[PDB]
Amino acid sequence: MLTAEEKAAVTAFWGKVKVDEVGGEALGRLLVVYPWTQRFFESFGDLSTADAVMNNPKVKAHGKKVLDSFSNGMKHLDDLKGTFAALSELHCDKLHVDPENFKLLGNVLVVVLARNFGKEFTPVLQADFQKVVAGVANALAHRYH
């Protein structure tokens, strides 16, 4: 993955992110933009509209948990596999989420970081982040391979 250069850039940027807010926005947008994903969260309540999804308290809370899991991976950029082992078993074995979807969430996170950091979220930084989100998506779909 990343060189020490990239790792440093990535890490510093990460310090500015509010996981609660960014986490809720990212999961909310996944549910809105790729509707079939709503199938996995039937018990979250009302996801009928874009506004419904975005203001849903369970989405906001779940969202935070997802990002927390990202922050942990950020700390272990060389052993992503190990850092998402049990999460892989849950998503693949129990939930049966198609791995393509892990990719979608990764991409949605990038968009959200772009929306939230503007001009600060440079093509170069974005490129490093694409590497990270791809890494995370790989570690999760590992119970599939």
Binding site: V32, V111, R115, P123, Q126
Partner: protein
């Protein structure tokens, strides 16, 4: 297959892009090349350097095409017939690449229209770009 809400969202969003479409188009290409390096294999006769005038030039072209598509939402196969022939038959671009460029555009728009880029708009733009991408890979059994 864009709905009434979708068409409105796309037209509204594009209206916000306004005169920056060319610049956003260029930025989108540049983010694609950096993030998905395998895409550069389609532009060997191009100077892909940062700030390259060729990329900025090509960006403007991509933007003008999207600007046209935004007013032919009912007949995309029609407004981009010629483009489908180029991408599909002449350059035979791998369909996966359309997703990479679409992604780069959304990242670009999000970056410039924070307050305009709502989940509903994001969803519409996404559907729009997927529709355009389908047209450009049409022929392409």
């Amino acid at each position: 297959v864009l709905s009434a809400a979708d068409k409105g969202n796309v037209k509204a969003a594009w209206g916000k892009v306004g005169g920056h479409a060319a610049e956003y188009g260029a930025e989108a290409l540049e983010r694609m090349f950096l993030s998905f390096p395998t895409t550069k294999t389609y532009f060997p006769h191009f100077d892909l350097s940062h700030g390259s005038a060729q990329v900025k030039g090509h960006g403007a072209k991509v933007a003008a095409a999207l600007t046209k598509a935004v007013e032919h939402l009912d007949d995309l196969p029609g407004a981009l017939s010629e483009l489908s022939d180029l991408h599909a038959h002449k350059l035979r671009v791998d369909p996966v690449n359309f997703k990479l460029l679409s992604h780069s555009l959304l990242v670009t728009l999000a970056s410039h229209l924070p307050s305009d880029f709502t989940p509903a708009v994001h969803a519409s733009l996404d559907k729009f770009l997927a529709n355009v991408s389908t047209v450009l890979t049409s022929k392409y059994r």
